Design a protein around this ligand. Structure first.
Ligand SMILES: CC(=O)N[C@@H]1[C@@H](O)[C@H](O)[C@@H](CO)O[C@@H]1O
Ligand SMILES: [Cl-]
Ligand SMILES: [Cl-]
Ligand SMILES: [Cl-]
Ligand SMILES: [Cl-]
Ligand SMILES: [Cl-]
Ligand code: NA
Length: 129
């Protein structure tokens, strides 16, 4: 499923991401846009042989099981396929664990490079939240 911007801001808000660990909603929407283009079906293979899955490109090295990343962890206790669902619950719950893990939203390369220190409120401007 490819979300509209405001559609994803609202879903993310429903699911408890707004100001989660002090990260305003625009931070999450911005990170989704540059990680996945708001496409829940996005998959990308990494040089280390891990894969990034879903709307927030969560990595099979640490966070989910895809049965093809030797010596990896599954710290969100889910099949990586769970993160490709049109329902973002699984992605959001895993994201909450990731942003709680010490480094905050810097775990998302696209967030660090494209959203951090920007006017991220512009990503929720004019949305019914
Ligand atoms: C939270 C999370 O798993 N982030 C991943 C990161 O590990 C990976 O290096 C990057 C590749 O572009 O995609 C995502 O940002
Ligand atoms: Cl957009
Ligand atoms: Cl594996
Ligand atoms: Cl949803
Ligand atoms: Cl933080
Ligand atoms: Cl915001
Ligand atoms: Na894994």
């Amino acid at each position: 499923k490819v979300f509209g911007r405001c559609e994803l801001a609202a879903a993310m808000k429903r699911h408890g991401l707004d100001n989660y660990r002090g990260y305003s909603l625009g931070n999450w929407v911005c990170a989704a846009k540059f990680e996945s283009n708001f496409n829940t079906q996005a998959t990308n293979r990494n040089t280390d042989g891990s894969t990034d899955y879903g709307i927030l490109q969560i990595n099979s090295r640490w966070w989910c099981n895809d049965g093809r990343t030797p010596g990896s962890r599954n710290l969100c206790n889910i099949p990586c396929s769970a993160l490709l669902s049109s329902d973002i619950t699984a992605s959001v719950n895993c994201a909450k664990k990731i942003v709680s893990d010490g480094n905050g939203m810097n775990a998302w390369v696209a967030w660090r490079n494209r959203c951090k220190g920007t006017d991220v409120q512009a990503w929720i401007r004019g949305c019914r939240l």
